[PDB]
Design a protein around this nucleic acid. Structure first.
Lengths: 114, 114
DNA sequence: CTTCTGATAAAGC
């Protein structure tokens, strides 16, 4: 039954592997969800908890804001959601607004399993 | 299909095991769900009943109010839900709000079974 | 107009 919980999990991990990748950009594009490269799990939880708090604008795109300024949520700007200190500016709730609150709690209460 | 119910059950027991622990803090942090430590079964129901009535604000964080004062549901303050006197306050219904009613009712049947 | 609530539905199993 999990669809919206599924792709946001795989998109967060796949994008975070390209952020922390320190090699040539030719093999950065071939990085996938199954590739064995380092990603921060705490930024992955922060990204999903951010997309939990999405707010789109009348033009139907999600507009965020961080300490450098307001930015559209797009492919080259999706790495900025890995930080906790982002506040959304929007007229209406986003596509996944309040839909991953159950998903983040299950994610956090599994990482801190000893 | 009970991942939300299984998560809050493991989360309530593991946290209640930590709170009732009276030993050294080094042992406290490695306390897990299987660890044979004392936990109040009635306090676990109170936390699950409270999280059944949780209310969140616009920032998608569950805000609570008790005798000590207003607080936000997080790992530092989630122990305050083991009391039944704490009341929710929020703009909208929480993640587990209304979704644990049968889960509590099934649990109290096992406890009150003679 | 947006938000929230509630109801209907579909799920997989």
């Amino acid at each position: 039954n999990d669809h919206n919980q599924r792709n946001v999990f795989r998109q967060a991990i796949t994008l975070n592997k390209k952020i922390h990748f320190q090699g040539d950009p030719a093999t950065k594009e071939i990085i996938s969800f199954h590739s064995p490269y380092y990603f921060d799990i705490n930024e992955v939880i922060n990204y999903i908890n951010n997309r939990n708090n999405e707010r789109k604008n009348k033009d139907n795109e999600h507009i965020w804001s961080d300490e450098e300024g307001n930015f559209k949520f797009d492919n080259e700007n999706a790495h900025r959601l890995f930080k906790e200190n982002v506040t959304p500016d929007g007229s209406s709730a986003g596509a996944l607004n309040g839909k991953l609150l159950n998903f983040v709690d299950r994610l956090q209460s599994k990482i801190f399993d000893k």
